[PDB]
Amino acid sequence: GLRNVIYINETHTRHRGWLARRLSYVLFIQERDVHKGMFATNVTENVLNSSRVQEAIAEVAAELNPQSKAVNKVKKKAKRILQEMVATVSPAMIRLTGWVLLKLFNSFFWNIQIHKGQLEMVKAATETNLPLLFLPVHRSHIDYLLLTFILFCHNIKAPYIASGNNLNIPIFSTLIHKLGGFFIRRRLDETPDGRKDVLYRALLHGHIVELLRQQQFLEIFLEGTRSRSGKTSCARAGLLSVVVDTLSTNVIPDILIIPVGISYDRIIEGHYNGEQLGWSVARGVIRMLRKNYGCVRVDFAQPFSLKEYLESQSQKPVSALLSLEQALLPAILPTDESLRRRLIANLAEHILFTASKSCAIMSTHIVACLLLYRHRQGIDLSTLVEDFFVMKEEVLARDFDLGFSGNSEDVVMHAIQLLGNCVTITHTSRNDEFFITPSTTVPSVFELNFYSNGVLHVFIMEAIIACSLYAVLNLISQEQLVRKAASLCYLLSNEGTISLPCQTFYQVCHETVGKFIQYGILTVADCYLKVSQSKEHQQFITFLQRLLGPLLEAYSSAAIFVHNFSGPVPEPEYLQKLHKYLITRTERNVAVYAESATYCLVKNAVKMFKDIGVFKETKQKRVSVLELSSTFLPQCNRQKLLEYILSFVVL
Numbered sequence: 001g002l003r004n005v006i007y008i009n010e011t012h013t014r015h016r017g018w019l020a021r022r023l024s025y026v027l028f029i030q031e032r033d034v035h036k037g038m039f040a041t042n043v044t045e046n047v048l049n050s051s052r053v054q055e056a057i058a059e060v061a062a063e064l065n066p067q068s069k070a071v072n073k074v075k076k077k078a079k080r081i082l083q084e085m086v087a088t089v090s091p092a093m094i095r096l097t098g099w100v101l102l103k104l105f106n107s108f109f110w111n112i113q114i115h116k117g118q119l120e121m122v123k124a125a126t127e128t129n130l131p132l133l134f135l136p137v138h139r140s141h142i143d144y145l146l147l148t149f150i151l152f153c154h155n156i157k158a159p160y161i162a163s164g165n166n167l168n169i170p171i172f173s174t175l176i177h178k179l180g181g182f183f184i185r186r187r188l189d190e191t192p193d194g195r196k197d198v199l200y201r202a203l204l205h206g207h208i209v210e211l212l213r214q215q216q217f218l219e220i221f222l223e224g225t226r227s228r229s230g231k232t233s234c235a236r237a238g239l240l241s242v243v244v245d246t247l248s249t250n251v252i253p254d255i256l257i258i259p260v261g262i263s264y265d266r267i268i269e270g271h272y273n274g275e276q277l278g279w280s281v282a283r284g285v286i287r288m289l290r291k292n293y294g295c296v297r298v299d300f301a302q303p304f305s306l307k308e309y310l311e312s313q314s315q316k317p318v319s320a321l322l323s324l325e326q327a328l329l330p331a332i333l334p335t336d337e338s339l340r341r342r343l344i345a346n347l348a349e350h351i352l353f354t355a356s357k358s359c360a361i362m363s364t365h366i367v368a369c370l371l372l373y374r375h376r377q378g379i380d381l382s383t384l385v386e387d388f389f390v391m392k393e394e395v396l397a398r399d400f401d402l403g404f405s406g407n408s409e410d411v412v413m414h415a416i417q418l419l420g421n422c423v424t425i426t427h428t429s430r431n432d433e434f435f436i437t438p439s440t441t442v443p444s445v446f447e448l449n450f451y452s453n454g455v456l457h458v459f460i461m462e463a464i465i466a467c468s469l470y471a472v473l474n475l476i477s478q479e480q481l482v483r484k485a486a487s488l489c490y491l492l493s494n495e496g497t498i499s500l501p502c503q504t505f506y507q508v509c510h511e512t513v514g515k516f517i518q519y520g521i522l523t524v525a526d527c528y529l530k531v532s533q534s535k536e537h538q539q540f541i542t543f544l545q546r547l548l549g550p551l552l553e554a555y556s557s558a559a560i561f562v563h564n565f566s567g568p569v570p571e572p573e574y575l576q577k578l579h580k581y582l583i584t585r586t587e588r589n590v591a592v593y594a595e596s597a598t599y600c601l602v603k604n605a606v607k608m609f610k611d612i613g614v615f616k617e618t619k620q621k622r623v624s625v626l627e628l629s630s631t632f633l634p635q636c637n638r639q640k641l642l643e644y645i646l647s648f649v650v651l
């Protein structure tokens with residue numbers, strides 16, 4: 001029950017015949033319904049006529065005086081900001097781009113899958129007179145080309161995209177402006193001379209207020225950048241404040257929010273090893289686009305009402321105040337605007353979770369997951385083909401989408417040829433069957449790990465309970481397992497979203513222990529559970545244990561570096577000589593999983609220690625210098641902090 005948006009023969013057009021086939025596409029572009037009338041107009045004028053904006057202008061001028069006829073200057077400046085900000089969509093441009101993208105996608109992709117039922121909802125959300133808001137998860141640059149192209153090819157008007165100021169350059173800007181992309185500043189700060197450019201912020205508020213008030217569609221990537229790790233990073237609540245404020249003020253009745261999940265079998269950009277490790281370009285871009293990449297699946301979550309969601313928050317009698325340190329450390333070592341911050345901050349996480357949990361699991365995702373953790377030593381095809389069937393069922397049985405179908409053999413054989421850089425395909429003695437080992441080198445592994453992290457979010461919970469199960473043992477008391485698991489969540493907090501922000505970890509772990517008894521891995525003898533001593537269950541427990549190896553090893557070997565920490569140092573200088581150590585631990589062959597040396601997990605560990613408050617952040621001259629906290633001034637605390645993390649990791 002799917003749809004391939006790129007698959008366009010004459011059957012997708014009205015006119016038919018030899019000629020009508022030969023020019024199939026050009027007709028399909030002609031038949032699309034996009035006119036100038038259904039786009040917001042008089043935007044600059046309406047934003048410059050705003051009573052908030054003119055008052056914001058009125059006071060910024062007032063400061064500059066010894067009558068006050070300098071208003072001309074600030075007003076003339078205020079205009080120029082909107083002149084570089086606002087977008088101006090041209091149906092002519094959109095069609096002609098859509099045509100090109102329909103050629104190019106059909107060149108360097110195999111297909112782009114859409115579940116009709118998910119879009120038939122969006123076409124019901126469209127035909128109610130409300131402004132929609134599309135919140136995808138940033139992974140590759142192609143994300144912002146797809147989201148629009150998918151809608152354009154179902155007779156839906158292109159959304160106005162919130163774009164980084166980087167792209168604002170001559171020619172390339174005036175193209176983007178005509179394709180809906182409106183440019184916004186980074187940090188919204190002219191200079192540290194001024195506190196806040198009240199004018200710019202008021203104009204930015206006004207623009208979005210106006211663009212929503214005219215019932216147009218908005219596209220915001222809540223992840224400031226695309227993910228280097230290959231999993232959803234920390235959500236930014238920058239613009240969601242601007243969009244919620246619009247509702248808070250009562251200038252528009254309601255907004256619909258649509259989480260989107262775009263999964264790639266192979267991202268055009270490829271591995272991020274170049275960053276994670278720490279003429280000739282244009283040649284590289286030719287070398288880039290001449291390669292083929294795999295399948296794509298874009299998954300739209302159910303549109304929900306922000307108005308109702310914001311009411312639903314006011315039904316909660318008490319909010320979550322517990323600190324990451326106050327959760328963990330006491331178990332290891334014997335308001336007015338702050339509520340408003342948390343309120344909008346949680347929404348962003350709730351969205352990214354919903355989006356990330358829509359993303360379809362790919363073939364590469366499943367192959368990498370097996371190759372890294374299930375085997376590593378490397379296996380002959382037949383065993384991997386039989387496993388690829390077994391894993392596929394494990395994913396479907398947990399209610400997740402697959403971005404592949406057909407013969408397991410062929411779906412794996414396709415997926416190998418994408419991982420051809422990491423994977424080595426050889427011939428074994430007295431066999432017609434071919435052998436498959438992955439790379440365990442410094443640079444190659446990161447590519448396998450990156451694509452492997454695609455599946456991590458399906459098993460992330462069961463893995464925490466699987467690690468905690470091993471932890472508690474060194475006839476389990478259920479309370480202790482939940483209590484122990486609950487911290488391993490607070491510890492791996494920064495690494496990624498584990499569950500919905502609206503419920504506590506205790507409950508999530510209780511439910512996931514509740515799942516293990518339903519599967520029948522744990523059974524009843526306060527409650528006393530026993531682990532099923534069955535080959536299949538044990539190998540699954542050890543797979544789930546192994547799966548979190550890199551994510552614990554890095555956090556362990558991070559604390560091994562803290563053991564000897566000399567004086568206060570700037571963080572950007574520290575992170576490099578912490579990241580050096582983890583590379584040096586592969587270089588010497590001390591670190592087990594070479595995955596751990598990735599730059600992403602280093603930032604997570606330091607932010608985790610900064611959340612725990614081992615390093616007291618005392619930022620100066622616009623950089624974070626790390627002060628070794630009074631609690632962790634002695635050695636015996638850091639010793640226990642090291643001993644603790646070691647309990648979860650298998651030796």
Ligand SMILES: CC(C)(COP(=O)(O)OP(=O)(O)OC[C@H]1O[C@@H](n2cnc3c(N)ncnc32)[C@H](O)[C@@H]1OP(=O)(O)O)[C@@H](O)C(=O)NCCC(=O)NCCS
Nearest residue numbers: 162163164186187188221224236237238239241341344345
């Ligand atoms: C413009 C943008 C950069 C703003 O984020 P930022 O400036 O980096 O983040 P800050 O926390 O410094 O934002 C400052 C303001 O945001 C608002 N804000 C940020 N987090 C907030 C939260 N949790 N609750 C309420 N308001 C919040 C406040 O009004 C805050 O005011 P302040 O300056 O007095 O603190 C925005 O782009 C963003 O972060 N999110 C969208 C990402 C994006 O579209 N990037 C382009 C690539 S497609």
Ligand SMILES: CCCCCCCCCCCCCCCC(=O)OC[C@@H](O)COP(=O)(O)O
Nearest residue numbers: 097098144148149152161163164179181225226
């Ligand atoms: C049918 C035709 C479809 C029309 C397609 C038009 C698409 C318009 C694109 C608008 C401009 C892009 C949107 C903003 C995205 C953006 O700003 O990406 C850059 C950052 O996130 C990532 O930065 P980094 O990872 O640090 O390089």
